Chains A and B, each alone.
Chain A
């Protein structure tokens, strides 16, 4: 697809202004919960490497791990949703503007289609 050269694109914008017309991901998004789970696993591994009681060594450190992962994951999800929206928008616009490349197929019914039959013997 290569939307790097897409016209009207700001060189270093993480989320453009037009991205604000899309619904934001919910705070209970399953992907956000998975990001928080990744942060929790990072905290547990940090406890294990430093040779501390894994489950209950640093609660502030684990909370910061989870919170940072959730924050970055929320913004990443917003950007990903925006990029897929752009892809679909361009696809539909291109199909609309080139009708001779996407003709409407003349609908046919299985009663008037001759399909070959292969017996299983």
Chain B
């Protein structure tokens, strides 16, 4: 599309998210979600092909259903109390409806099915936006109403998300589906700590966003969308593959990398509330994410796969466009564990 129109649409997406984040009226939050959904569809469909169109319609149907149930929950809450302010939910049925709507907006299990297909259908830039920016508004709304969530439903959906992400990532050779399942598992980790501490949720979201931005930018730099295509990168730019390997090790929660900070903290917080079994199962299940990260690292940088002759021509050329903040994203996603006590800034 025209660059002016693209910039306007991106600004509209961000403005819808910010309208959700700054408003105290339920109708304005709904309007922010509507504006975000309206501006999001062209961004997914920017490169026109049947796959992108299919992904856009799937995303539209899912988000429209979620927004309809969100409006229903708002109306029920207003019926049982003449309130429009986003606070305590005042009704269990309305709160269950709101939780389910926000879960489908986020892609938590069992509403996870659309995330892998939408991510596979769209390009890498649209996938970056969808997996990083499109999580802020529902998580902020969940943080604002955390004191009213039924912990049983929230914890059930979080544990299901962790399990589903871990199991679904094992079967994937497409990198975008791997990212989608990783996102589902990280969303489960984020939402398993909402009932106890929203600061932990925000810290996990920040760390995950940094890591996802770094990995998506590394995938864009080495324009690969499959495992075998990524296995050719060492013969053109081995530095990119080494950086990606360290980032993948960080994403697996291995200390002393940055990705260890959230789980650690979350586990600690859960233990402070006499919750022992669930964090144990959560770490056991995150082992699966680590396994398929390690498989990608094996195929990418720790071994050398066969190349092709036409790669020689590619040796004579350099990337014309360089993404700023990529080095900062890599450093922030690998080496911020010693600065862990900074979380008291209520990030």
Count A-B contacts at CB 8 Å.
50
A40 nearest in chain B by CB position: B331
Residue contact A83 to B331, C-beta cutoff 8 Å = no
Residue contact B328 to A42, C-beta cutoff 8 Å = yes
Interface check A38, CB cutoff 8 A: yes
Q: Which residues of A contact B308 (CB under 8 A)?
A: none
Interface check B11, CB cutoff 8 A: no
Residue contact A3 to B346, C-beta cutoff 8 Å = yes
Interface check A96, CB cutoff 8 A: no
B346 nearest in chain A by CB position: A83
Q: Which residues of A contact B240 (CB under 8 A)?
A: 49
Residue contact B344 to A87, C-beta cutoff 8 Å = yes
Q: Which of A63-112 contact B (CB under 8 A)?
A: 76-77, 79-80, 83-84, 87
Residue contact B198 to A34, C-beta cutoff 8 Å = no
Q: Which residues of A contact B197 (CB under 8 A)?
A: 2
Per the bound structure, the CA–CA distance linking A83 and B345 in Å amounts to 7
Interface check A55, CB cutoff 8 A: no
Interface check B284, CB cutoff 8 A: no
Q: Which residues of B contact A51 (CB under 8 A)?
A: 318
Residue contact B344 to A80, C-beta cutoff 8 Å = yes
Interface check B162, CB cutoff 8 A: no
Interface check B311, CB cutoff 8 A: no
Residue contact B345 to A45, C-beta cutoff 8 Å = no
Q: Which of B38-46, B95-103, B288-296, B332-340 contacts A (4 or more CB under 8 A)?
A: B332-340
Q: Which residues of B contact A31 (CB under 8 A)?
A: 338-339
A45 nearest in chain B by CB position: B327
Q: Which residues of B contact A42 (CB under 8 A)?
A: 327-328, 330-331
